[PDB]
Amino acid sequence: VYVYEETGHITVFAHDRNGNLSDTLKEDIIDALQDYRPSGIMLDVTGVEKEEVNVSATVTISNKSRIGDT
Amino acid sequence: VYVYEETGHITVFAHDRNGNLSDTLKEDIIDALQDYRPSGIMLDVTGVEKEEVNVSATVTISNKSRIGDT
Amino acid sequence: LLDQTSGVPSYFSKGADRLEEKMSLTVNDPTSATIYTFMDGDLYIQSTNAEMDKINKVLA
C-alpha cells in the first residue's frame, strides 16, 4: 500500500500480489478503513499503476549439448 | 448518539431520555469532544429531530361495567 | 458555481446562486416583446438600421 496524501484528500493505492485490485477487494479495504480513516476527510481507493514487462531474451550457451527445454 | 459525516464537517445528534438536548448538556458534549475531534475539522452538536406523535384512540370494550377513569 | 479554490464538494463549497434569463421565440404572445410583424406570411414593416422609439418620436 502507498498512501498518497493531499490537503483534505487521501488516495490509497493498493494492490494484491499479482498487482491487480478487484472490486471485492477494494470494498473490503474500504470497510476495513472505516475504523481507521480520519473523520471528515475524503478518502479514495484505487489500483496501482501496473506495468506489464514482456521479455524476449537471446542467450548463447558454451556447452551446446545442454540446450533443451529444461 | 448519531454521528453524520461530511467532507470537512462533523455534526453530532444527541438526546436525553426525554428526546431533548439541554444547552448545558450540549456544552458538556462540546467540551468532551474537544479532545476527540480530528485536527483541522469542524465539529458541531445539535439536538435530535424529535417528533411528538399525538394519538387519539377509540377503544371498544366488552365489559361495560368496568368502564371508568382508571 | 462551487468554490473554485477547493474545487471539490464540501460543507464550505456551496455559495451564492445565479439568476439565468434565457430568451425564447414566440408567435402571437402579447406579453412578449414584438420584433417582427407579418401579414399572410409577408413582411409588414422593415427597419434598415437601429430602432429607437423615443428618438424617432422626437424626430417625427
UniProtKB/TrEMBL annotation, chains A, B:
It comes from the Viruses. This is Baseplate component. It comes from Staphylococcus phage 812.
From TrEMBL, chain C:
It comes from the Viruses. This is Uncharacterized protein. The chain holds residues 123 to 182 of 1152 of the full protein. It comes from Staphylococcus phage 812.
